[PDB]
Amino acid sequence: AAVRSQIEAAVYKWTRPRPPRLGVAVPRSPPGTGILFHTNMQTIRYSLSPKVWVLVTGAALVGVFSGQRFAQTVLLSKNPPNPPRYREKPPVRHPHTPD
């Protein structure tokens, strides 16, 4: 549990997002400007920060392929060698051959 909190606090500190490098030409907000809008505005989707998104998405990818390996090695089985192919007698006549 001590190690759990340690790694949890280590991940958290590293992932805290930095301000975005805006790829758009917007003004600077006037200084001292607080909340102007309200919560009845059309909801804006809550998006993970890039670092966090990579971490969880990477955990998902490592998870699905490790799950694929677990199924392949434990749940599934390999083909045993094919049965020996011995000479066998074919039927004497085709069932539809006129007599």
Binding site: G23, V24, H38, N40, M41, Q42
Partner: protein
């Protein structure tokens, strides 16, 4: 609350199927005799005489609307002079309760918001490039396989036997070389 109960009174349930009495009880096909309603039937629908038999577009009841001075009647605006200025008061439509019925209260709030636009020109341009060239790559990935399999069907092979197959209505004839 139930908004239907607010305008229940206006909606009186009907008596006749399809809202008309039998033609015998009242002849709705005839033109109304009421003054000023010569273009309407008794039930209120437009009469065939007005719309078909004597349609004005066909030259019946010729009456040019425009006057000598090239003018037609036009209704003016509601003008209200005030504060040393002539103002026009616009016509506001009646309350939607009058026209639709529901009482205009407890309306959900939909705020003003400017159009939802995609930003970051550079990012958008790259996506559009991918929207076009990712399919192009896939097509190119199929192109080589397509050529090979086509070449395979049309390969000059050292065939040693021939079977001729003719299709007729409705059976298949087969011609084969007979052993010597």
């Amino acid at each position: 609350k139930s908004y239907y109960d607010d305008f229940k009174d206006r909606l009186k349930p009907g008596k006749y199927t399809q809202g008309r009495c039998p033609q015998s009880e009242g002849d709705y096909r005839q033109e109304s005799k009421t003054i000023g309603r010569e273009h309407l039937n008794d039930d209120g629908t437009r009469s065939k005489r007005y719309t078909v038999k004597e349609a004005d577009a066909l030259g019946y009841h010729y009456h040019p609307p425009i006057d000598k001075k090239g003018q037609v009647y036009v209704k003016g605006p509601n003008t209200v002079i005030e504060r040393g200025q002539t103002w026009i008061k616009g016509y506001e439509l009646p309350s939607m309760e009058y026209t639709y019925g529901p009482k205009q209260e407890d309306i959900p709030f939909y705020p003003r918001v400017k159009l939802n636009v995609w930003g970051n020109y550079n990012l958008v341009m790259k996506v559009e490039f991918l929207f076009f060239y990712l399919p192009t790559i896939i097509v190119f990935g199929i192109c080589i396989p397509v050529y090979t399999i086509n070449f395979a069907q049309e390969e000059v092979i050292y065939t040693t036997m021939t079977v001729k197959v003719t299709g007729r209505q409705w059976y298949w004839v087969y011609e084969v070389e007979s052993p010597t």
